[PDB]
Amino acid sequence: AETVSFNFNSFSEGNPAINFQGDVTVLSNGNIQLTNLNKVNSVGRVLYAMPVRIWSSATGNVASFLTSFSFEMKDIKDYDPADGIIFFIAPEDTQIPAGSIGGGTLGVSDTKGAGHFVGVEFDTYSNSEYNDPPTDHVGIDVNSVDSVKTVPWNSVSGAVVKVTVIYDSSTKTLSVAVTNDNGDITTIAQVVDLKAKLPERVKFGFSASGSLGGRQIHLIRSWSFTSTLITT
Amino acid sequence: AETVSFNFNSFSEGNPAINFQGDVTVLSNGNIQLTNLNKVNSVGRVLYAMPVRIWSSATGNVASFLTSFSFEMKDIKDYDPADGIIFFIAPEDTQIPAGSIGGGTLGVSDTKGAGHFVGVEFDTYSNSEYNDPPTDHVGIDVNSVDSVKTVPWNSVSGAVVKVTVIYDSSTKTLSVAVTNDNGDITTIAQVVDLKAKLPERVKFGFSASGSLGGRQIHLIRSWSFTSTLITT
Amino acid sequence: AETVSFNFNSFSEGNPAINFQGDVTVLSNGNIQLTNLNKVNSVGRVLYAMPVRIWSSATGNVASFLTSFSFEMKDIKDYDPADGIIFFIAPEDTQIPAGSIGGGTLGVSDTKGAGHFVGVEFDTYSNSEYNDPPTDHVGIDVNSVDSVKTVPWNSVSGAVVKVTVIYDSSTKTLSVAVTNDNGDITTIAQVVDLKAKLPERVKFGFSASGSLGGRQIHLIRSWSFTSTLITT
Amino acid sequence: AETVSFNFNSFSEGNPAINFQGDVTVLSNGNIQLTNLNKVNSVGRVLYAMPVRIWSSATGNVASFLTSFSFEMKDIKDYDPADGIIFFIAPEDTQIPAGSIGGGTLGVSDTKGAGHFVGVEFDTYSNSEYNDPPTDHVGIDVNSVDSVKTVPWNSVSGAVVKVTVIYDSSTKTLSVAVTNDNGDITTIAQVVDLKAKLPERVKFGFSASGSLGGRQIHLIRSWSFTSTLITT
Ligand SMILES: OC[C@H]1O[C@H](OC[C@H]2O[C@@H](O)[C@H](O)[C@@H](O)[C@@H]2O)[C@H](O)[C@@H](O)[C@H]1O
Ligand SMILES: OC[C@H]1O[C@H](O)[C@H](O)[C@@H](O)[C@H]1O
Ligand SMILES: OC[C@H]1O[C@H](O)[C@H](O)[C@@H](O)[C@H]1O
Ligand SMILES: OC[C@H]1O[C@H](O)[C@H](O)[C@@H](O)[C@H]1O
Ligand SMILES: [Ca+2]
Ligand SMILES: [Ca+2]
Ligand SMILES: [Ca+2]
Ligand SMILES: [Ca+2]
Ligand SMILES: [Mn+2]
Ligand SMILES: [Mn+2]
Ligand SMILES: [Mn+2]
Ligand SMILES: [Mn+2]
C-alpha cells in the first residue's frame, strides 16, 4: 500500500512541500492568495511539491483518494469578480500555459480551452467561448475548461466554502460535495478514467486566474489529502 | 431548497434527537455502544429521531447528501471479533427484525439476509451464508447483507476509523471513503436509486450485532450529516 | 539487565495488575475513566501494581524508560473542561492526598500544590495559584503542580491524543512528545534527576481531577512501558 | 503550524516519496536492503524525497520531531558482521561521499570520518581510526563518525530492532530509545544544535556500508515521522 497524505491548516512561503507558480502569494494569516489584483490576466497556482503515483503500468492498479479543502472569493471594486478557482490533477512537469491569458482558462489551459489535466472548477464568470452555463457553477473538467459536466452553484462574496472530493478507482468515479455558506450542499459526480487521461505520476493543486476587467481575491484556506495505490 | 444538517460530537441516551433500539447503550464518555457484550445475539441500533425527506413524489427530485462519522471496534477474550457495524437508511417505521438472530445479519435483515434498507456495512466476520469475502470488508448493501459490491478492508481493534460518504442524486452514486490506522484509505462506490429502493421519507442510523461466540465492542463516536433536496 | 515491560490495549477493573484509587471507573469499552462527572472535586488515579525499581542502592545506577500511552478528554455541558491528566511516578505507597480538593491539584498534591512525585501533566485550566500559563499546556512536574517548565498546547475535546515519553538516565533527561488531533507534534524536555527526587521502588500511573464547576471526561485508552536498569 | 508527517510500513521500488542512492534495493517483502553483499565497500542510502525545513531564517525557530523505525542486521557466511546502520539528517543535496570507502564511514563521511550530517549510528564493528568503542554501540554523530557520545549496545543477528527518537527544539535535545530483541531498552541523549549544524532545508534517511572483508545484511523495515515548526 503506497500512500500519500498531508494536512495544511494554513500555509507559509518557505515550506518546500509546496510548489508556487505565477502570481501566487501567502498572506500573513496563513492563507494562500492565488492571484494579483494589480496585474492583467493574473495567474497563480499552488501544487503539492511531491508527485503522486496514481497508477502503475506494472500492476495496472489505479489509486483512490480522499481530499478536502476550503477557499474564499471576495469581490473587489471595480472589476468583474472573475474568473474563479479550480482544483486539478496534472502531469508532474505541469506549468502555467505559455503566454496564458488567464480569464476563463483558470490558468490550466490555452485559449482554445484545452490542456493536459483533470479538475473540479468553481466558475464565477460565464465564458461563452467555453460553453459555460449562464450562472455560477461547479464543473468536472478533463483536458478542457469546457466542462464534461457542470452543476448550478453560487459564489457568495466573502464566504468560506467547504469542499470534499472522493475518487474511487474501482468505478473511476469522481465525487464532489460542496457546502455553501448557508449549510446547503451541492454535488456533482462523474466517471473519469485517470489512468487513461494522465501519466502514472502527477501533481495536485489549485489554480485561479483573472484578466483585464475581471479580477477578484482567490484564497485557498485549508487542504487535507490522502491517496492510496494498492501494490499487491 | 430543503436542507437538513446536524452534528454529534458525543451522544446521550437522554437526547430526543435520537431513537435507541435493541441493546444500545450510551457510555459515560458520550460513546454509543450498539451491542451488549454480555448478551447473546445482541442487536443494537441508533437512528436520527426526525425522518429525512430524500425524494419527492410531486417533483421527482432526489436529494444529495454528505455525511461523515467515526466509529471504533475492539476485541475481547475469548470470543470472535464480530459481527460488524452498518450505516443504513430505511423506512421511518423501521424496527429491528422480528426474532433477530443478530450475528451476520448486522441486526438489519432476516435469517435469509433480507430487509428493507440501503446501507454501508463494516464487516469483521466472513459469513458464507451471505456470500462474504474471505476477509474483513466494507460493503454496499441494498435490501440484503449479501453486498452488491465489496472491498477488502481491515478492522483494527481499538482504532478510531473515519468515514465519509457522498450521495450524488443526479448520477445516483453512493461513494464511500474509509481511513484506516495505517493512514491508508479505502473506497467503494456503487450506483443506487434511493428513489426506487426507499420511501420518500426515511431514517438514517447505525446498527450492529453479535452471535453466540461472536462478540466485540461497537462504538459510534461522532456523526455529522447534511442533505439537500431541491424544490424548484 | 533488570527490565520491566508491559502493554495494555484496554483495561478491566478485574485484572489486578493495576491499583484503582479514587473515582476511577472502567468503561465497558476498556477505557479507564478517571473522574466522576456527577461528583464534586472528583479524583481518580491508576497505578501499575508492580513497583518499579528505578535505581539500585548498590550500583548507584538509574533506569531508563520508554513509555507511550493514548488519552482522550472531552467536554460536557455545562461545566468548564477541567482540570487535566497527569502521567506520574511516585512512591509505591502513594495515595490521593488526604482531603484532596481536586481541581488544579490534579490529585497529586495538597492545597499549595506540593506533593511527592514526578510527572508530565496535560493541564486544561489556567490555575493562577499554581503559576499556570494562560492557555492549555503540557508541563513537567517535580513534587509540585507549579511546573518546572511547560510548553503551549491545546486540548481538543473528543480528540484521541498519543504521547511518547523517554527518560535517559545518563543525562537525567525526560523527553515528551505529544501528537495532537490535527497531526502536529508538541514536545518538551527537562533534566530531572529521578534518583534524587524519588525512592528505589516507585509506581507509574495517571491521575485526573475536577472541582465544583470544573469537569470533563478524562480517559486513558492504552499504555505501553519498558524500563531497564543496568545491574552489571 | 508547519508540519511534515508520513508513515512507511513497507516500501516499494517506484514510490516517488523515496530517493535511493547507491547499492540500495527493495526486497520482495517490502524491506529495503541498504547494501550489496557481493560488492566491496558497498554503500546504500535511502532518503525521504521531499526536503524538510527544520528551521526558519525568518523566525529563527527550530522545529521538533518524533520518529520511530525498525531495522534488521543479519550475518552471512562468511564475512565479518559489519559495518552498520545510521539514521541521519543532512543538506538536501546530500550524495554518497566521493570515493567513499564504505566500512566505518557508514556511507556518510569521508575516509577521515568527516562529513556534513547529523545522525544516530548503530555500529557493529569497532573502527579505532574513528575512536570506536570496543563493543557494538549506538551513537550520536555530528559531522563525524567519531561519535559525539556512545552507549554500549548489542547487535543480534536476525533480530528486529525498534527505535524511537525525539528532538526537542527548545532544549535542542536529541533523544534515542532502542529496543533489543529481548525486550530490553538502551537509550542515549545529547544536546545538538540543528540550527547551527545544518542548513534550513535538509533530508532524512538511512545509510549502511561494508568493506571487502566486512559485510552483512542491513535491512530497513519501517519508518514513521512527524516534524512541526512554529510559524507564529
Ligand atoms: O472553572 C473550574 C475551576 O474552578 C476552580 O477555580 C478556582 C476558583 O476558586 C474560587 O475560589 C475563587 O473564588 C475563584 O476566583 C477561582 O477562579 C478550581 O480551583 C479550578 O481548578 C477549576 O476547576
Ligand atoms: O469582464 C470579465 C470577463 O472579461 C472577459 O471577457 C474575459 O475573457 C472573461 O474571462 C471575464 O474575465
Ligand atoms: O464466530 C462468530 C461467528 O459465528 C457464526 O458462524 C455466526 O453465524 C457468525 O455471524 C459469527 O457470529
Ligand atoms: O572486518 C571488517 C572491517 O574491515 C576493515 O578493517 C574496515 O576498515 C572496517 O570498516 C570493517 O569493515
Ligand atoms: Ca469561465
Ligand atoms: Ca458477515
Ligand atoms: Ca491548572
Ligand atoms: Ca565503526
Ligand atoms: Mn465553466
Ligand atoms: Mn458482508
Ligand atoms: Mn500547569
Ligand atoms: Mn562509532
Tab-separated table of N, CA and C in Angstrom, chain B residues 90-200:
chain	number	residue	atom	x	y	z
B	90	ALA	N	-33.386	3.637	5.981
B	90	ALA	CA	-34.579	2.800	5.912
B	90	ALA	C	-35.888	3.552	6.161
B	91	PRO	N	-37.028	2.853	6.024
B	91	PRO	CA	-38.335	3.473	6.246
B	91	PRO	C	-38.351	4.079	7.633
B	92	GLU	N	-39.124	5.141	7.819
B	92	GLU	CA	-39.172	5.797	9.116
B	92	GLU	C	-39.717	4.893	10.216
B	93	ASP	N	-40.480	3.877	9.833
B	93	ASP	CA	-41.066	2.971	10.813
B	93	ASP	C	-40.171	1.773	11.090
B	94	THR	N	-38.959	1.793	10.548
B	94	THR	CA	-38.044	0.676	10.741
B	94	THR	C	-37.866	0.282	12.204
B	95	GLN	N	-37.749	-1.025	12.424
B	95	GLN	CA	-37.555	-1.622	13.740
B	95	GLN	C	-36.657	-2.828	13.530
B	96	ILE	N	-36.043	-3.316	14.601
B	96	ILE	CA	-35.172	-4.482	14.491
B	96	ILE	C	-35.992	-5.671	13.995
B	97	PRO	N	-35.421	-6.479	13.086
B	97	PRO	CA	-36.086	-7.658	12.520
B	97	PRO	C	-36.704	-8.552	13.586
B	98	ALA	N	-37.949	-8.972	13.366
B	98	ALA	CA	-38.649	-9.835	14.314
B	98	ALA	C	-37.842	-11.108	14.519
B	99	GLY	N	-37.602	-11.439	15.784
B	99	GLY	CA	-36.829	-12.622	16.099
B	99	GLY	C	-35.497	-12.544	15.388
B	100	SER	N	-34.676	-11.580	15.788
B	100	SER	CA	-33.369	-11.383	15.175
B	100	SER	C	-32.296	-12.274	15.782
B	101	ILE	N	-31.618	-13.032	14.927
B	101	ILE	CA	-30.540	-13.907	15.365
B	101	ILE	C	-29.238	-13.106	15.377
B	102	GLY	N	-29.360	-11.787	15.192
B	102	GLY	CA	-28.198	-10.912	15.169
B	102	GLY	C	-27.109	-11.482	14.276
B	103	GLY	N	-25.965	-11.801	14.875
B	103	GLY	CA	-24.862	-12.378	14.127
B	103	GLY	C	-24.531	-11.693	12.816
B	104	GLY	N	-24.405	-12.482	11.755
B	104	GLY	CA	-24.068	-11.924	10.456
B	104	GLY	C	-25.159	-11.133	9.759
B	105	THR	N	-26.231	-10.795	10.471
B	105	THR	CA	-27.319	-10.031	9.869
B	105	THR	C	-27.185	-8.560	10.235
B	106	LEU	N	-26.153	-8.258	11.014
B	106	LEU	CA	-25.883	-6.894	11.451
B	106	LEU	C	-27.127	-6.216	12.032
B	107	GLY	N	-28.096	-7.030	12.443
B	107	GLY	CA	-29.313	-6.508	13.037
B	107	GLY	C	-30.241	-5.715	12.130
B	108	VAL	N	-30.112	-5.893	10.818
B	108	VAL	CA	-30.963	-5.159	9.892
B	108	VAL	C	-31.715	-6.047	8.898
B	109	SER	N	-31.385	-7.336	8.874
B	109	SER	CA	-32.047	-8.268	7.962
B	109	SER	C	-32.626	-9.474	8.691
B	110	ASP	N	-33.201	-10.393	7.923
B	110	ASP	CA	-33.770	-11.602	8.491
B	110	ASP	C	-32.729	-12.710	8.349
B	111	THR	N	-33.056	-13.907	8.809
B	111	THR	CA	-32.122	-15.020	8.726
B	111	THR	C	-31.622	-15.253	7.306
B	112	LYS	N	-32.487	-15.000	6.331
B	112	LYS	CA	-32.127	-15.179	4.931
B	112	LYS	C	-31.221	-14.040	4.465
B	113	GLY	N	-31.146	-12.988	5.277
B	113	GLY	CA	-30.313	-11.842	4.955
B	113	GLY	C	-31.004	-10.811	4.081
B	114	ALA	N	-32.270	-10.534	4.376
B	114	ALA	CA	-33.028	-9.574	3.592
B	114	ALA	C	-33.896	-8.665	4.445
B	115	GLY	N	-33.870	-7.377	4.116
B	115	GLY	CA	-34.662	-6.399	4.840
B	115	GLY	C	-34.890	-5.200	3.949
B	116	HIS	N	-35.645	-4.220	4.435
B	116	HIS	CA	-35.906	-3.017	3.652
B	116	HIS	C	-34.948	-1.944	4.152
B	117	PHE	N	-33.846	-1.752	3.430
B	117	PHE	CA	-32.833	-0.772	3.815
B	117	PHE	C	-31.682	-0.708	2.809
B	118	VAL	N	-30.985	0.422	2.815
B	118	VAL	CA	-29.817	0.605	1.973
B	118	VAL	C	-28.790	1.105	2.959
B	119	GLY	N	-27.603	0.516	2.929
B	119	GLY	CA	-26.579	0.948	3.855
B	119	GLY	C	-25.173	0.548	3.465
B	120	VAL	N	-24.228	0.982	4.296
B	120	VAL	CA	-22.812	0.690	4.117
B	120	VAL	C	-22.402	-0.136	5.319
B	121	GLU	N	-22.025	-1.385	5.087
B	121	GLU	CA	-21.626	-2.249	6.186
B	121	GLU	C	-20.115	-2.298	6.434
B	122	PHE	N	-19.753	-2.606	7.676
B	122	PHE	CA	-18.365	-2.723	8.104
B	122	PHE	C	-18.194	-4.111	8.735
B	123	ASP	N	-17.990	-5.091	7.864
B	123	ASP	CA	-17.861	-6.499	8.228
B	123	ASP	C	-16.544	-6.988	8.824
B	124	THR	N	-16.624	-7.670	9.965
B	124	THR	CA	-15.432	-8.203	10.619
B	124	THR	C	-15.394	-9.736	10.616
B	125	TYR	N	-16.475	-10.355	10.141
B	125	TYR	CA	-16.579	-11.813	10.070
B	125	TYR	C	-17.061	-12.259	8.685
B	126	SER	N	-16.554	-13.393	8.209
B	126	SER	CA	-16.923	-13.907	6.890
B	126	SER	C	-18.052	-14.946	6.871
B	127	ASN	N	-19.299	-14.481	6.835
B	127	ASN	CA	-20.440	-15.390	6.790
B	127	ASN	C	-20.553	-15.949	5.385
B	128	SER	N	-20.544	-17.272	5.268
B	128	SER	CA	-20.656	-17.916	3.965
B	128	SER	C	-22.113	-17.947	3.483
B	129	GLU	N	-23.049	-17.929	4.431
B	129	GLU	CA	-24.470	-17.958	4.106
B	129	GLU	C	-24.911	-16.670	3.443
B	130	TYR	N	-24.037	-15.672	3.444
B	130	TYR	CA	-24.366	-14.399	2.828
B	130	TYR	C	-23.339	-14.060	1.770
B	131	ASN	N	-22.610	-15.078	1.327
B	131	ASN	CA	-21.578	-14.909	0.315
B	131	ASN	C	-20.644	-13.747	0.634
B	132	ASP	N	-19.906	-13.888	1.733
B	132	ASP	CA	-18.958	-12.878	2.196
B	132	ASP	C	-17.546	-13.100	1.701
B	133	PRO	N	-16.802	-12.005	1.498
B	133	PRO	CA	-15.417	-12.111	1.038
B	133	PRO	C	-14.696	-12.848	2.160
B	134	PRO	N	-13.608	-13.559	1.844
B	134	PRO	CA	-12.889	-14.281	2.898
B	134	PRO	C	-12.308	-13.420	4.029
B	135	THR	N	-12.154	-12.118	3.793
B	135	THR	CA	-11.574	-11.231	4.802
B	135	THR	C	-12.496	-10.127	5.292
B	136	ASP	N	-11.987	-9.313	6.217
B	136	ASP	CA	-12.749	-8.185	6.736
B	136	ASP	C	-13.100	-7.380	5.491
B	137	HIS	N	-14.180	-6.614	5.536
B	137	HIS	CA	-14.524	-5.822	4.369
B	137	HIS	C	-15.553	-4.733	4.592
B	138	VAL	N	-15.643	-3.853	3.603
B	138	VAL	CA	-16.606	-2.766	3.606
B	138	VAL	C	-17.488	-3.118	2.425
B	139	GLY	N	-18.802	-3.074	2.619
B	139	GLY	CA	-19.702	-3.413	1.537
B	139	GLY	C	-20.875	-2.470	1.405
B	140	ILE	N	-21.409	-2.394	0.188
B	140	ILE	CA	-22.569	-1.559	-0.118
B	140	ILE	C	-23.713	-2.554	-0.213
B	141	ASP	N	-24.701	-2.434	0.673
B	141	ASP	CA	-25.832	-3.360	0.677
B	141	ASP	C	-27.146	-2.680	0.335
B	142	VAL	N	-27.954	-3.344	-0.485
B	142	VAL	CA	-29.259	-2.810	-0.866
B	142	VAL	C	-30.335	-3.860	-0.598
B	143	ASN	N	-30.959	-3.783	0.571
B	143	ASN	CA	-32.004	-4.724	0.967
B	143	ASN	C	-31.493	-6.131	1.269
B	144	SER	N	-30.182	-6.265	1.444
B	144	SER	CA	-29.582	-7.562	1.729
B	144	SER	C	-28.154	-7.434	2.237
B	145	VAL	N	-27.753	-8.320	3.144
B	145	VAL	CA	-26.392	-8.283	3.656
B	145	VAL	C	-25.490	-9.065	2.713
B	146	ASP	N	-26.044	-9.433	1.558
B	146	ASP	CA	-25.282	-10.111	0.513
B	146	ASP	C	-24.952	-8.902	-0.379
B	147	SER	N	-23.888	-8.197	-0.004
B	147	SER	CA	-23.422	-6.984	-0.663
B	147	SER	C	-23.434	-6.898	-2.186
B	148	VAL	N	-23.935	-5.777	-2.696
B	148	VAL	CA	-23.964	-5.542	-4.131
B	148	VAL	C	-22.505	-5.548	-4.591
B	149	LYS	N	-21.657	-4.905	-3.794
B	149	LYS	CA	-20.230	-4.851	-4.076
B	149	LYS	C	-19.485	-4.792	-2.743
B	150	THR	N	-18.198	-5.120	-2.759
B	150	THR	CA	-17.389	-5.071	-1.550
B	150	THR	C	-15.947	-4.696	-1.874
B	151	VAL	N	-15.162	-4.440	-0.830
B	151	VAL	CA	-13.749	-4.096	-0.974
B	151	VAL	C	-12.991	-4.620	0.243
B	152	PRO	N	-11.845	-5.289	0.014
B	152	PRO	CA	-11.033	-5.828	1.109
B	152	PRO	C	-10.650	-4.702	2.059
B	153	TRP	N	-10.998	-4.880	3.325
B	153	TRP	CA	-10.727	-3.896	4.359
B	153	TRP	C	-10.035	-4.612	5.515
B	154	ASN	N	-9.829	-3.904	6.617
B	154	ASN	CA	-9.179	-4.485	7.780
B	154	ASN	C	-9.631	-3.746	9.026
B	155	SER	N	-10.350	-4.451	9.891
B	155	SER	CA	-10.840	-3.870	11.131
B	155	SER	C	-9.780	-4.011	12.219
B	156	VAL	N	-9.102	-2.904	12.511
B	156	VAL	CA	-8.066	-2.860	13.539
B	156	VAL	C	-8.688	-2.545	14.892
B	157	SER	N	-8.567	-3.486	15.815
B	157	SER	CA	-9.116	-3.338	17.154
B	157	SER	C	-8.602	-2.108	17.927
B	158	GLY	N	-9.517	-1.376	18.554
B	158	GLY	CA	-9.132	-0.209	19.332
B	158	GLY	C	-8.849	1.053	18.535
B	159	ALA	N	-8.924	0.943	17.211
B	159	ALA	CA	-8.670	2.067	16.309
B	159	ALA	C	-9.922	2.863	15.939
B	160	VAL	N	-9.796	4.189	15.962
B	160	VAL	CA	-10.889	5.084	15.587
B	160	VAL	C	-10.812	5.246	14.075
B	161	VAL	N	-11.894	4.902	13.392
B	161	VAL	CA	-11.953	4.974	11.941
B	161	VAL	C	-12.832	6.122	11.501
B	162	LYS	N	-12.386	6.867	10.499
B	162	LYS	CA	-13.193	7.967	9.989
B	162	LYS	C	-13.847	7.551	8.670
B	163	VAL	N	-15.126	7.867	8.518
B	163	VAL	CA	-15.833	7.510	7.292
B	163	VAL	C	-16.532	8.709	6.673
B	164	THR	N	-16.396	8.824	5.354
B	164	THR	CA	-17.021	9.899	4.594
B	164	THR	C	-17.850	9.287	3.457
B	165	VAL	N	-19.090	9.737	3.327
B	165	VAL	CA	-19.987	9.219	2.305
B	165	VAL	C	-20.643	10.337	1.504
B	166	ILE	N	-20.658	10.187	0.184
B	166	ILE	CA	-21.290	11.188	-0.657
B	166	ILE	C	-22.379	10.559	-1.509
B	167	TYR	N	-23.532	11.205	-1.561
B	167	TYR	CA	-24.580	10.694	-2.412
B	167	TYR	C	-24.941	11.749	-3.442
B	168	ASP	N	-24.631	11.464	-4.700
B	168	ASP	CA	-24.940	12.385	-5.781
B	168	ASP	C	-26.246	11.935	-6.416
B	169	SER	N	-27.327	12.662	-6.150
B	169	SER	CA	-28.633	12.294	-6.695
B	169	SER	C	-28.592	12.095	-8.207
B	170	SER	N	-28.135	13.115	-8.923
B	170	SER	CA	-28.050	13.064	-10.376
B	170	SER	C	-27.579	11.715	-10.914
B	171	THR	N	-26.367	11.308	-10.542
B	171	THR	CA	-25.830	10.038	-11.014
B	171	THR	C	-26.300	8.850	-10.203
B	172	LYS	N	-26.975	9.110	-9.085
B	172	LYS	CA	-27.478	8.065	-8.182
B	172	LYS	C	-26.341	7.305	-7.504
B	173	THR	N	-25.132	7.846	-7.570
B	173	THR	CA	-23.975	7.184	-6.985
B	173	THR	C	-23.796	7.397	-5.488
B	174	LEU	N	-23.299	6.360	-4.827
B	174	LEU	CA	-23.021	6.391	-3.400
B	174	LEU	C	-21.526	6.069	-3.246
B	175	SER	N	-20.726	7.093	-2.955
B	175	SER	CA	-19.283	6.925	-2.792
B	175	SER	C	-18.905	6.876	-1.330
B	176	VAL	N	-18.005	5.954	-0.991
B	176	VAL	CA	-17.521	5.808	0.386
B	176	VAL	C	-15.980	5.800	0.539
B	177	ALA	N	-15.479	6.546	1.516
B	177	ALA	CA	-14.043	6.602	1.776
B	177	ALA	C	-13.806	6.338	3.247
B	178	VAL	N	-12.939	5.370	3.521
B	178	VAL	CA	-12.624	4.982	4.884
B	178	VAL	C	-11.146	5.126	5.197
B	179	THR	N	-10.833	5.780	6.306
B	179	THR	CA	-9.441	5.974	6.702
B	179	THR	C	-9.042	4.958	7.752
B	180	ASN	N	-8.006	4.183	7.460
B	180	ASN	CA	-7.528	3.183	8.404
B	180	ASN	C	-6.530	3.749	9.417
B	181	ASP	N	-5.961	2.852	10.218
B	181	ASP	CA	-4.986	3.204	11.244
B	181	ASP	C	-3.666	3.529	10.543
B	182	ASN	N	-3.259	2.659	9.622
B	182	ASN	CA	-2.018	2.858	8.882
B	182	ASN	C	-2.078	4.108	7.998
B	183	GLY	N	-3.116	4.922	8.186
B	183	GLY	CA	-3.257	6.140	7.405
B	183	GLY	C	-3.695	5.954	5.960
B	184	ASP	N	-3.710	4.712	5.493
B	184	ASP	CA	-4.125	4.415	4.129
B	184	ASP	C	-5.641	4.555	4.023
B	185	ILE	N	-6.150	4.765	2.812
B	185	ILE	CA	-7.589	4.899	2.637
B	185	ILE	C	-8.183	3.812	1.750
B	186	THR	N	-9.465	3.558	1.967
B	186	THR	CA	-10.193	2.548	1.226
B	186	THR	C	-11.465	3.188	0.717
B	187	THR	N	-11.857	2.857	-0.505
B	187	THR	CA	-13.071	3.434	-1.046
B	187	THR	C	-13.889	2.426	-1.819
B	188	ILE	N	-15.163	2.761	-1.963
B	188	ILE	CA	-16.108	1.939	-2.685
B	188	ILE	C	-17.283	2.828	-3.034
B	189	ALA	N	-17.702	2.726	-4.286
B	189	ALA	CA	-18.821	3.483	-4.812
B	189	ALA	C	-19.708	2.473	-5.530
B	190	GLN	N	-20.976	2.823	-5.703
B	190	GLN	CA	-21.940	1.960	-6.365
B	190	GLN	C	-23.209	2.756	-6.594
B	191	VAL	N	-23.712	2.701	-7.823
B	191	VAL	CA	-24.935	3.397	-8.177
B	191	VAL	C	-26.097	2.722	-7.470
B	192	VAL	N	-26.943	3.527	-6.838
B	192	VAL	CA	-28.104	3.018	-6.138
B	192	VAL	C	-29.198	4.060	-6.223
B	193	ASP	N	-30.376	3.643	-6.669
B	193	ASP	CA	-31.513	4.552	-6.794
B	193	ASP	C	-32.298	4.581	-5.479
B	194	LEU	N	-32.050	5.589	-4.647
B	194	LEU	CA	-32.765	5.683	-3.375
B	194	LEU	C	-34.257	5.817	-3.648
B	195	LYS	N	-34.574	6.558	-4.696
B	195	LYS	CA	-35.954	6.795	-5.071
B	195	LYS	C	-36.711	5.494	-5.330
B	196	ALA	N	-36.040	4.508	-5.924
B	196	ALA	CA	-36.664	3.219	-6.241
B	196	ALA	C	-36.590	2.173	-5.138
B	197	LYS	N	-35.616	2.302	-4.248
B	197	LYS	CA	-35.452	1.335	-3.175
B	197	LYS	C	-35.990	1.774	-1.819
B	198	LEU	N	-36.196	3.077	-1.636
B	198	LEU	CA	-36.687	3.591	-0.357
B	198	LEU	C	-37.858	4.549	-0.504
B	199	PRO	N	-38.619	4.751	0.585
B	199	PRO	CA	-39.770	5.659	0.581
B	199	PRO	C	-39.275	7.102	0.520
B	200	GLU	N	-40.186	8.045	0.308
B	200	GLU	CA	-39.808	9.447	0.219
B	200	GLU	C	-39.298	9.919	1.568
